[PDB]
Structure 1
Amino acid sequence: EAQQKTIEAITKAINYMAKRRIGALLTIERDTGMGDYIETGIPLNAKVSSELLINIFIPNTPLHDGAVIMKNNEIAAAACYLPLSESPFISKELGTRHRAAVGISEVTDSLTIIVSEETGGVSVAKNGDLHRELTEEALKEMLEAE
């Protein structure tokens, strides 16, 4: 329905950034209110689009430094601050975004997508779990369920 657009929007944004290595962190809210994490960012309350998500994460842009939070079908806020996880199961040699994605997913029902800036690998984190190196069909299948 209106689920299809907006999944399509996210996949084409994720896939675009992947080819190029741009770090991204995007969290989709569900049943656990993230209002306290939204007020740490730049508020947009903007309508979700592939072009806008690309533009939010540009390697040194103002809005790039943190996480984009999604609520409703909108970009609630960009450049948000999440809490990190002192999990040993996060492979180091990475982090920063990866430790904030699992960090937020420990405390929330949310779903977080990460693109690594070093390699271009898409990860996802739910309920404290981090799954590295996902395929395009695996991300779409993971998202469609949401």
Structure 2
Amino acid sequence: SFVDLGISTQRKIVYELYFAVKYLSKNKVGAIITLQRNILLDSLRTDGVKIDSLINSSLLIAIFQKSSPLHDGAVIIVDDRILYASTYFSVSESTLEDRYGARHRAALGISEVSDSITVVVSEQSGEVVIVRDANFFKVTNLETFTEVLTKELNSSQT
């Protein structure tokens, strides 16, 4: 559903996510941002706060600060809106409760049951990955981010 938006809207989403990721990665702030595409994620949602806001780098940075009520769980972006924050899913990979690898596992789970793209920033290393269909594209150079993410969002869907 990203592919159906005007080029201005797509470019906005990518740039805002870019600024957010630059901050989060540099300061080693964990985050899970999931862009839903054609498979609607609402069916698989366990918990989560619905905020239905415009997507914005500053709001994202606020959401994922350690002292924030919304920094655990996943943000779900639908078209150009942050629909949910602190979202969890009943996928069968995020059933471990071990902290290490938790967001990577949650992202993998989501990617296995939907065509969604999921950016993950690691609280430990600040490393950034783009998770899609059980693959982890590791973004070692953040100045490739906008390009990589764009390709991911325009790939073949379900």
* CA deviation map 1:78-137 (0-9, x unaligned): 000033528xxxxx9941000000110001000000111111100111101123353223
- Of 129, 132, 143, the residue aligned with 1:123 is 129
Secondary structure of 2:9's match?
coil
Secondary structure in 2 matching 1:6? helix
- Pick from 23, 30, 38 the counterpart of residue 31 of structure 1: 38
| 1:101–1:114 Cα contact (<8 Å) kept | yes
Name the counterpart of 1:144: 150
Matching residue within 4, 9, 22 for 2:29: 22
Q: Which residue of 1 aligns with 2:58?
A: 51
Q: Alpha-carbon deviation of 1:23?
A: 0.2
Q: How well do the aligned residues superpose, as a CA RMSD in angstroms?
A: 1.9
For structure 2, the residue ranges without an aligned partner over 5 or more in a row are: 1-7, 154-158
**Partners of 2:16 and 2:57 within 8 A in 1:** yes
CA contact (8 A) 1:38 1:76 kept: no
Residues 42-86 of structure 1: CA deviation (Å, up to 9, x unaligned):
110000000000011011310111000000100001000033528
Distance in 1, matches of 2:99 and 2:87, equals: 23
Counterpart of 2:88 in structure 1: which amino acid?
A: Y
- TM-score normalised per structure 2: 0.82
TM-score normalised to structure 1 length: 0.88
Alpha carbons 1:84, 1:100 under 8 Å: kept: no
Q: Partner residue of 2:93? A: 85
How many angstroms apart in 2 are the aligned matches of 1:93 and 1:50? 26
Aligned pair partner of 2:120 in 90, 93, 114: 114
Q: Is the 8 A contact 1:84 1:99 kept in 2?
A: no
> Helix, strand or coil for the counterpart of 2:11?
coil
Matched-pair identity in %? 35
